[PDB]
Amino acid sequence: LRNRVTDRYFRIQEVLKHARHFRGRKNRCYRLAVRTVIRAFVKCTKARYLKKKNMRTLWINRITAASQEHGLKYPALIGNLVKCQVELNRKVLADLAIYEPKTFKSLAALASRRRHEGFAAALGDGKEPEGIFSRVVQYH
Amino acid sequence: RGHKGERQRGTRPRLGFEGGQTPFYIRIPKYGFNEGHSFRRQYKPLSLNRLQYLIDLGRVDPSQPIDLTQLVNGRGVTIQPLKRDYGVQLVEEGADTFTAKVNIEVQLASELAIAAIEKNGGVVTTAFYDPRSLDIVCKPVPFFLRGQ
Amino acid sequence: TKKRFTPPIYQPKFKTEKEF
Amino acid sequence: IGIRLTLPPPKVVDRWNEKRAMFGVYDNIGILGNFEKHPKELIRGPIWLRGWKGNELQRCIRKRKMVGSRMFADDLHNLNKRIRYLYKHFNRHGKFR
Amino acid sequence: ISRKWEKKNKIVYPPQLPGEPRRPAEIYHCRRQIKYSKDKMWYLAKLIRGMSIDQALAQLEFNDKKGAKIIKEVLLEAQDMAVRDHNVEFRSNLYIAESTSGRGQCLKRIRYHGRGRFGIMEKVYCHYFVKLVEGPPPPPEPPKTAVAHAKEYIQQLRSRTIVHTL
Amino acid sequence: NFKRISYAKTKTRAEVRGGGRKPWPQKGTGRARHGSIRSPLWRGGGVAHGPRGPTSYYYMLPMKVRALGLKVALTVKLAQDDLHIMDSLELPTGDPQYLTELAHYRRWGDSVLLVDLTHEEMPQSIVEATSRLKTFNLIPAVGLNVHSMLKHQTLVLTLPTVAFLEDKLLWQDSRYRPLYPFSLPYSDFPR
Amino acid sequence: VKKGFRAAFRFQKELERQRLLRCPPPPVRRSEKPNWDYHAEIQAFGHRLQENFSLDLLKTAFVNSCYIKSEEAKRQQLGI
Amino acid sequence: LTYFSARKGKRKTVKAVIDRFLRLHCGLWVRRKAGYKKKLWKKTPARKKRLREFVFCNKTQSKLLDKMTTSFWKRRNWYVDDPYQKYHDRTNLKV
Amino acid sequence: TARGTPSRFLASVLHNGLGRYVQQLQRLSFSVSRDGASSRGAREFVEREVIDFARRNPGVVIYVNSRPCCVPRVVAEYLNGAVREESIHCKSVEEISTLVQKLADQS
RNA sequence: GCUAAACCUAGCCCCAAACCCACUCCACCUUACUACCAGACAACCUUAGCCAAACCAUUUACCCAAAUAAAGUAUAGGCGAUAGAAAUUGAAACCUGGCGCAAUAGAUAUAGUACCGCAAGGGAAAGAUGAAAAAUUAUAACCAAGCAUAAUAUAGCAAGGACUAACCCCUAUACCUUCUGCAUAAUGAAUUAACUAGAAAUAACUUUGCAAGGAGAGCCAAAGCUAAGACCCCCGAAACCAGACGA
RNA sequence: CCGAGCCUGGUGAUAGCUGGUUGUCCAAGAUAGAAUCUUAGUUCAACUUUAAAUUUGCCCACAGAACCCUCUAAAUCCCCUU
RNA sequence: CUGAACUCCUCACACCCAAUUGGACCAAUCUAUCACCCUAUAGAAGAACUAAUGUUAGUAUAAGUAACAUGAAAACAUUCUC
RNA sequence: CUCUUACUUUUAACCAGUGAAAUUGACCUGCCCGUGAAGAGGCGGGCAUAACACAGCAAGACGAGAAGACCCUAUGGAGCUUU
Ligand SMILES: [K+]
Ligand SMILES: [K+]
Ligand SMILES: [K+]
Ligand SMILES: [K+]
Ligand SMILES: [K+]
Ligand SMILES: [K+]
Ligand SMILES: [K+]
Ligand SMILES: [K+]
Ligand SMILES: [K+]
Ligand SMILES: [K+]
Ligand SMILES: [K+]
Ligand SMILES: [K+]
Ligand SMILES: [K+]
Ligand SMILES: [Mg+2]
Ligand SMILES: [Mg+2]
Ligand SMILES: [Mg+2]
Ligand SMILES: [Mg+2]
Ligand SMILES: [Mg+2]
Ligand SMILES: [Mg+2]
Ligand SMILES: [Mg+2]
Ligand SMILES: [Mg+2]
Ligand SMILES: [Mg+2]
Ligand SMILES: [Mg+2]
Ligand SMILES: [Mg+2]
Ligand SMILES: [Mg+2]
Ligand SMILES: [Mg+2]
Ligand SMILES: [Mg+2]
Ligand SMILES: [Mg+2]
Ligand SMILES: [Mg+2]
Ligand SMILES: [Mg+2]
Ligand SMILES: [Mg+2]
Ligand SMILES: [Mg+2]
Ligand SMILES: [Mg+2]
Ligand SMILES: [Mg+2]
Ligand SMILES: [Mg+2]
Ligand SMILES: [Mg+2]
Ligand SMILES: [Mg+2]
Ligand SMILES: [Mg+2]
Ligand SMILES: [Mg+2]
Ligand SMILES: [Mg+2]
Ligand SMILES: [Mg+2]
Ligand SMILES: [Mg+2]
Ligand SMILES: [Mg+2]
Ligand SMILES: [Mg+2]
Ligand SMILES: [Mg+2]
Ligand SMILES: [Mg+2]
Ligand SMILES: [Mg+2]
Ligand SMILES: [Mg+2]
Ligand SMILES: [Mg+2]
Ligand SMILES: [Mg+2]
Ligand SMILES: [Mg+2]
Ligand SMILES: [Mg+2]
Ligand SMILES: [Mg+2]
Ligand SMILES: [Mg+2]
Ligand SMILES: [Mg+2]
Ligand SMILES: [Mg+2]
Ligand SMILES: [Mg+2]
Ligand SMILES: [Mg+2]
């Protein structure tokens, strides 16, 4: 009994369908396409890490820009918002800067206020009571 | 198959070859463990336990003389004349519980096996069969079909 | 170094003789 | 290229032809027939393969032994050469020793 | 081999409605197995694309290439065929809608080299395809002007969204 | 499979016509090195690992296993209401339509295996009817086998056949291990 | 020529998809396509919308004057 | 080793093994010590006694010797008055 | 990959769920062979599951068609005009139940 | 839109059976195919070597008249590699079939022709409508590479993430083989189609049967025995020897 | 292509040497040595894998392991508990 | 403050080591029986190719590149030049 | 040769006809320094940079061609010599 592959055409089309938008002969020549298609799929897999990384870099750049408009550096805003128990993440903070500029100025003002309270406390010797915005809500 | 060498290509040395070191199976001195093995007489053991068990199940009849034919026809012993078997040796295993009275013809019998049969009123005889005779007595029907 | 020569091999004629 | 552009002619199989209908009959010729005939005697084919099985080297040796004297000169030469090649392969070449 | 170009002159369209615009006549003609290169023939076919039938014939009559005479011969029989069999009123009212060359069936021959070596020589053949459409030749495209560039640039600026956010 | 003999065969590189000479020198030509034009790499060359027939597939299940299989097939037919016992296979007529109509009326399925005790003593009427049919097949008791029983949806046995099959199949359960082939004379066999 | 039917059948299916894509068929009413029961479709329409429609009124709402005038013309053409 | 003989297509026994080793039915192989007949004048009595011993082979050697012999040599034999009859069967062997 | 395929923005059909939720699945067409082995799981789904599934979804018209077929299929049609064909070849009854429920929940 | 693509027959393979063997007239061992002249010459005679023994030097299976079994036993042997009986035992046997190939397959075969060689010798390729061609203005189209329709716009393994947006932004040192380690300026590869490479004993394991027995004479057996399943590739030297052909 | 012609056959010469070795998916997985005309390879150990059996394995408290001689070394071995 | 495939978070989980080894599936083909717009359960086997300076065929690249060819006029008769 | 120059023919380039070969993983085929299987068009840091022909040139593509002939290895060959 002599067996021969009868559906090789379909096996080839499984790869070439992913190579139609490629440049040059590697969009139609299996030998060439198969290598480039594999590389494309590997890139797609690893890009999921970069997508997350690049998104956060973008948010920090955008938050940095918005903070500077109010005379605040990025680390001062983020650090002091945490000390106020405001857990807004960078994605939302970047969205607020673009579409809710009045709320963002309020957040910038709050961070600036908390930052100044920190300085007053550090300069004092413990005589002063805790700042109004420095008080932490305790949970149990 | 691995990578290169003789083994990937299927050219590794014969079994027993050790790479050039004088092989284990050659460096041992010759000794006559098996010298003359094919000319040694062999006897299939038949214990008194087996003999009694065959009698109790009706596979061997003690009312008639028992010999190699009756034992073979009862599937008590399997004799191989072509493997230098010369018959059955009666072995003493089971003597304490042997109760049957039998007239039995064997090729070899131990002293204690003879005592067991004789204590119970039976007769035991030691009989010699040559290789050809053993083949015929063990399987009579195939012989009769030869016309000799 | 021993003289090394490789002679040319002609292909079968018919392969260049087919007509319409 | 490489794939036919039309469907092949439909496959018509008569499952109840006499050959298929009676397949297997007398396979228990011995068990049900007092063992006068062995089922292997129902096998039809080359005289050196009836009721016997072996690897290609064994088949070659068996055929040369049973019908080698009746083989054609060219066929017998090929058979002798095949036996030599297979002898070398199985006895000297392989992964296991 | 494929011969679809000759079957395009056999398509009968259904009668037009009273208010529909008059459909231009389309005439497909070709010459098969020309002893000439398709690569060289491409240049002549390229030259006359979009030209009127008369302008194409004039350009080809004074070309020095061998293909020019062959194409001119094909164009003239296509023009005659358009009026005779395709109900084209004015023979001059035709323009080259399509003109291209194709590869023909070629022959292989041996070319001898020195030292007993050889090469395989191909005796090249080609096809020429032409489509004639009734009507004046379509006008050429005006060069994109500065106003168009500025309009396109500003359009791209106006389609620009805030990316990766709400 | 036990009686299968495959007749497929191909030629090795040693058996393909020609191929003696080395097609071109080992070195200097710039081409791949080759020893013979009939190598399996070449068009028209030998087959590397093709069929080497004729090839036999003979083997034998233990006699007891083949006997047990017959028992299982009969039980399955009875348990699934596909077994019908007849007193005899005598039909009123030799017309095949009668037998076909009888099976339809009795809801006997598309195909029926008819088993008689002996070939010689089969009634002439049933012989005439079955000879003209394709799904109604008449066999002697010695011809009964698992494949036929599974291929046919209904099994019909005569009462003498039933007694015949019980004797043969139950003999396998109570017998000694053989001393020589059962074809040779024994004390109590045959019967 | 290679043995087998499956690969050829699969290729026929693809040749028919490409043929259809090259010449997309003219669209037709869903009612004209298979698996259509008008009464069942009318009832599901109301249920999807969570509305207790009266099936007599709902059916009339879909009937248009153009469909009635044309339905009558077909009747006259067939002499019914 | 000859895996398939040219005349019979059957595996052959290496007769060098038969000449040197005794196989017990339990699977053990018994050999003599190399050099037990060599230069006894320079060997001590303790060493000479060790050389006279009949000793067993290890698992790896036993597996090799099994492969180098056919099944005939592994059958149970009943030689009359066999010196090694007792050693054929193991006793009180846990795993 | 993303560059090798089309994309769209997250959206709904006629602002679904804003004023009221409307199930988008509108029709289901089963094709189950009477005798095919591949359709065994589809036949068992039609005997006990399809009737109870229709009671829960009165806005979906289910068309069961028994005919000779080597590959049983379910065809889902939605109010927006989308048509989806999903094979149920050799699928178990539980597998088919899961698939059919997924089609009901999609837009 | 071209070039092309697609096909099912020609025949062939392995068995069975059967013993086998031709012829018109004329010409043909001289320079064969040459009507017609003085001769006388006559056939027989151990294969070798590759290869294995990891060199090699004795040695290294080759149908020789019944399947099986005895038995890989007796025996032979640098007692190494390996070689290897017999006595004895004793079965079946109905040609006209195929889980064989289907134009790169299957015979080399359309043919030992064309072609190549002084000679011995080597040795191809390919065909495809239909009931009718005394229907040839006929049988659709759709599919490899290659091109055409339709050249090109900063930047870089040619893609991925994306994006309103092709590109511009960001990330990213082809593949196989071979190596301590290869983007490597180490190997192979123009590309398409087709073809092209893992063969089995010894035991062991797994799943049935029966069980001190198993097995359809042989064999094994101190739970064994029978059956089955499942593991061992492809291409390549320079050589060696025998017999022919060549000044 | 004469350090000894050519063709055919033995012949599928042999090659510890180079090259090649075809569907998907998961899992465990790195390395003391000895001998060898042997070091471009093999066989045995060692390591690694699968199945099976039943019982300790690893980590380690005291106590304990040499004189001769210079660095009176970092440590090791043994080892209950855990 | 930034900063990983570390860790947490929502959901899921057999799903990142060469040689080698164990396991779960599987394209097409043939056969048995089903099935009947292309399948099922089994049995088989010439059973799967991005690589061997692989074999054969087609077509590219180099490239319309290297290279190749016909002394002159005329009435095609003839004459002239060499 | 100092030290080359001029002219003729061929080749050459352009037009027309005919039409090969080795070579080719894919190429969207820059320069500098640095790095790295240790000498980079492809990596890092810089610099440069609309697109596309034709004619030259031979510094690089460890350029093409020939599975290095030198050297070593193989229990691979062969010729020749010999106490
Ligand atoms: K072997
Ligand atoms: K011995
Ligand atoms: K040698
Ligand atoms: K051929
Ligand atoms: K390098
Ligand atoms: K390198
Ligand atoms: K190199
Ligand atoms: K490579
Ligand atoms: K002469
Ligand atoms: K290499
Ligand atoms: K080596
Ligand atoms: K001058
Ligand atoms: K250069
Ligand atoms: Mg992070
Ligand atoms: Mg390799
Ligand atoms: Mg190695
Ligand atoms: Mg010449
Ligand atoms: Mg040959
Ligand atoms: Mg030769
Ligand atoms: Mg060779
Ligand atoms: Mg062939
Ligand atoms: Mg040797
Ligand atoms: Mg004999
Ligand atoms: Mg052929
Ligand atoms: Mg194409
Ligand atoms: Mg970049
Ligand atoms: Mg190196
Ligand atoms: Mg690297
Ligand atoms: Mg490279
Ligand atoms: Mg190299
Ligand atoms: Mg195997
Ligand atoms: Mg020699
Ligand atoms: Mg040699
Ligand atoms: Mg000679
Ligand atoms: Mg002369
Ligand atoms: Mg010569
Ligand atoms: Mg080889
Ligand atoms: Mg792992
Ligand atoms: Mg030595
Ligand atoms: Mg080593
Ligand atoms: Mg401890
Ligand atoms: Mg983790
Ligand atoms: Mg996980
Ligand atoms: Mg499938
Ligand atoms: Mg294959
Ligand atoms: Mg391929
Ligand atoms: Mg290749
Ligand atoms: Mg050039
Ligand atoms: Mg030139
Ligand atoms: Mg000239
Ligand atoms: Mg030039
Ligand atoms: Mg030119
Ligand atoms: Mg190259
Ligand atoms: Mg550098
Ligand atoms: Mg480079
Ligand atoms: Mg070079
Ligand atoms: Mg080299
Ligand atoms: Mg040598």
Side-chain angles (χ1 to χ4, degrees), chain I residues 78-90:
Chain I
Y78 297 83
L79 287 176
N80 72 349
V83 177
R84 184 176 179 179
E85 178 161 62
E86 284 304 298
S87 178
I88 51 186
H89 187 279
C90 280

mmCIF file of all heavy atoms in Angstrom, chain I residues 78-90:
data_model
loop_
_atom_site.group_PDB
_atom_site.id
_atom_site.type_symbol
_atom_site.label_atom_id
_atom_site.label_comp_id
_atom_site.label_asym_id
_atom_site.label_seq_id
_atom_site.Cartn_x
_atom_site.Cartn_y
_atom_site.Cartn_z
ATOM 1 N N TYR I 78 -28.094 36.427 14.500
ATOM 2 C CA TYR I 78 -28.296 37.480 15.481
ATOM 3 C C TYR I 78 -29.067 38.640 14.864
ATOM 4 O O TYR I 78 -29.154 38.780 13.641
ATOM 5 C CB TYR I 78 -26.953 37.968 16.038
ATOM 6 C CG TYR I 78 -26.201 36.887 16.777
ATOM 7 C CD1 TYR I 78 -25.421 35.966 16.091
ATOM 8 C CD2 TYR I 78 -26.288 36.773 18.156
ATOM 9 C CE1 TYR I 78 -24.741 34.972 16.759
ATOM 10 C CE2 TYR I 78 -25.610 35.782 18.833
ATOM 11 C CZ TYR I 78 -24.839 34.884 18.130
ATOM 12 O OH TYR I 78 -24.162 33.893 18.798
ATOM 13 N N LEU I 79 -29.629 39.476 15.740
ATOM 14 C CA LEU I 79 -30.476 40.574 15.286
ATOM 15 C C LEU I 79 -29.718 41.545 14.391
ATOM 16 O O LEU I 79 -30.302 42.113 13.461
ATOM 17 C CB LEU I 79 -31.054 41.315 16.492
ATOM 18 C CG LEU I 79 -32.157 40.600 17.278
ATOM 19 C CD1 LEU I 79 -32.556 41.421 18.491
ATOM 20 C CD2 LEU I 79 -33.373 40.315 16.409
ATOM 21 N N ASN I 80 -28.427 41.756 14.650
ATOM 22 C CA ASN I 80 -27.636 42.652 13.815
ATOM 23 C C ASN I 80 -27.319 42.060 12.448
ATOM 24 O O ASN I 80 -26.699 42.743 11.627
ATOM 25 C CB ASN I 80 -26.338 43.031 14.535
ATOM 26 C CG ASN I 80 -25.341 41.888 14.598
ATOM 27 O OD1 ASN I 80 -25.667 40.741 14.292
ATOM 28 N ND2 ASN I 80 -24.113 42.200 14.991
ATOM 29 N N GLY I 81 -27.725 40.819 12.184
ATOM 30 C CA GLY I 81 -27.516 40.192 10.897
ATOM 31 C C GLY I 81 -26.346 39.237 10.832
ATOM 32 O O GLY I 81 -26.135 38.616 9.784
ATOM 33 N N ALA I 82 -25.581 39.098 11.910
ATOM 34 C CA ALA I 82 -24.441 38.193 11.910
ATOM 35 C C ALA I 82 -24.906 36.743 11.853
ATOM 36 O O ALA I 82 -25.907 36.368 12.469
ATOM 37 C CB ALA I 82 -23.585 38.421 13.154
ATOM 38 N N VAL I 83 -24.171 35.927 11.102
ATOM 39 C CA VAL I 83 -24.441 34.499 10.973
ATOM 40 C C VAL I 83 -23.188 33.743 11.389
ATOM 41 O O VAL I 83 -22.090 34.038 10.904
ATOM 42 C CB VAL I 83 -24.855 34.125 9.538
ATOM 43 C CG1 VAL I 83 -25.050 32.618 9.408
ATOM 44 C CG2 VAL I 83 -26.119 34.867 9.139
ATOM 45 N N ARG I 84 -23.353 32.773 12.286
ATOM 46 C CA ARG I 84 -22.246 31.978 12.797
ATOM 47 C C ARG I 84 -22.590 30.500 12.696
ATOM 48 O O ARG I 84 -23.650 30.074 13.161
ATOM 49 C CB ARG I 84 -21.928 32.344 14.248
ATOM 50 C CG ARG I 84 -20.725 31.614 14.809
ATOM 51 C CD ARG I 84 -20.406 32.078 16.214
ATOM 52 N NE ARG I 84 -19.271 31.362 16.781
ATOM 53 C CZ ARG I 84 -18.775 31.584 17.990
ATOM 54 N NH1 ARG I 84 -19.296 32.496 18.793
ATOM 55 N NH2 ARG I 84 -17.734 30.869 18.407
ATOM 56 N N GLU I 85 -21.692 29.726 12.095
ATOM 57 C CA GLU I 85 -21.853 28.285 11.949
ATOM 58 C C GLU I 85 -20.792 27.590 12.791
ATOM 59 O O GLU I 85 -19.594 27.805 12.585
ATOM 60 C CB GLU I 85 -21.739 27.866 10.484
ATOM 61 C CG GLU I 85 -21.857 26.369 10.261
ATOM 62 C CD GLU I 85 -22.205 26.016 8.827
ATOM 63 O OE1 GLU I 85 -21.402 26.330 7.925
ATOM 64 O OE2 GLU I 85 -23.283 25.428 8.603
ATOM 65 N N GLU I 86 -21.233 26.761 13.735
ATOM 66 C CA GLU I 86 -20.344 26.037 14.635
ATOM 67 C C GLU I 86 -20.622 24.548 14.515
ATOM 68 O O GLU I 86 -21.767 24.111 14.666
ATOM 69 C CB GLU I 86 -20.526 26.503 16.082
ATOM 70 C CG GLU I 86 -19.888 27.846 16.388
ATOM 71 C CD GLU I 86 -18.406 27.874 16.066
ATOM 72 O OE1 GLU I 86 -17.647 27.099 16.686
ATOM 73 O OE2 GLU I 86 -18.000 28.663 15.187
ATOM 74 N N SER I 87 -19.575 23.776 14.241
ATOM 75 C CA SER I 87 -19.714 22.332 14.138
ATOM 76 C C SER I 87 -19.885 21.705 15.516
ATOM 77 O O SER I 87 -19.282 22.145 16.499
ATOM 78 C CB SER I 87 -18.491 21.735 13.444
ATOM 79 O OG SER I 87 -18.587 20.324 13.364
ATOM 80 N N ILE I 88 -20.720 20.671 15.582
ATOM 81 C CA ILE I 88 -20.902 19.873 16.787
ATOM 82 C C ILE I 88 -20.498 18.421 16.539
ATOM 83 O O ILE I 88 -20.981 17.514 17.206
ATOM 84 C CB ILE I 88 -22.347 19.972 17.314
ATOM 85 C CG1 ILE I 88 -23.355 19.688 16.193
ATOM 86 C CG2 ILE I 88 -22.576 21.343 17.945
ATOM 87 C CD1 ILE I 88 -24.806 19.903 16.577
ATOM 88 N N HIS I 89 -19.611 18.204 15.570
ATOM 89 C CA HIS I 89 -19.159 16.867 15.214
ATOM 90 C C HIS I 89 -18.523 16.172 16.410
ATOM 91 O O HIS I 89 -17.551 16.668 16.986
ATOM 92 C CB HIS I 89 -18.160 16.966 14.062
ATOM 93 C CG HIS I 89 -17.744 15.644 13.499
ATOM 94 N ND1 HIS I 89 -16.776 14.857 14.084
ATOM 95 C CD2 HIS I 89 -18.153 14.977 12.394
ATOM 96 C CE1 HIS I 89 -16.612 13.758 13.369
ATOM 97 N NE2 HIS I 89 -17.437 13.806 12.339
ATOM 98 N N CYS I 90 -19.077 15.017 16.781
ATOM 99 C CA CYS I 90 -18.522 14.153 17.821
ATOM 100 C C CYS I 90 -18.443 14.839 19.181
ATOM 101 O O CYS I 90 -17.701 14.393 20.061
ATOM 102 C CB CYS I 90 -17.135 13.635 17.421
ATOM 103 S SG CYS I 90 -17.172 12.245 16.275
#
